[PDB]
Each structure stands twice: as structure tokens, then as C-alpha cells.
Amino acid sequence: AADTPTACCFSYTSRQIPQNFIADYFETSSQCSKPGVIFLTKRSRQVCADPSEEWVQKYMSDLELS
């Protein structure tokens, strides 16, 4: 779809999510005031995270290279 809500982050998790919790991720629209990475856990919980944090660039890379 399209013309439909877009997810935005207004706060970032403060602590590193354990990596084996992570099932997927995506980056939030550039239309959002903040840059965001939303991780999806295995229980399908969505979690906002700061793209400029080392551990999140880690998790993104590991996810992409598999």
C-alpha cells in the first residue's frame, strides 16, 4: 500500500537488544523528524533504535548478510 501511516521514532531504546532477539529491521522514512531503525523481535515487538549507534549498524549488517 501507499497513502497510509508511516512509522516514526521519537525515542530510541536506551540499551542494546540481545542480538538473538532480532528477526528483521527497517529504516524509517526521511520524512520523520528523527532518523530511526525499527527492529522487529521474534515476538513481533517493534523497537526504535539510533542508527548512529555501533551495535545497530552491526545488527543491520548481520541481518543483510544472511
Q: Which residues bind its own copies (CB under 8 A)?
A: 1, 3-13, 28-29, 31-33, 36, 38, 45-48
Nearer Cβ to its own copies, position 19 or 29? Answer: 29
Smallest gap from Cβ 65 to its own copies, in A, equals 25
Nearer Cβ to its own copies, position 6 or 66? Answer: 6
20, 58 in Cβ contact below 8 A?
A: no
23, 42 in Cβ contact below 8 A?
A: yes
Amino acid, single-letter form, for residue 18: P
Residue 9: CB atoms within 10 Å:
21
Smallest gap from Cβ 29 to its own copies, in A, equals 8
Smallest gap from Cβ 9 to its own copies, in A, equals 6
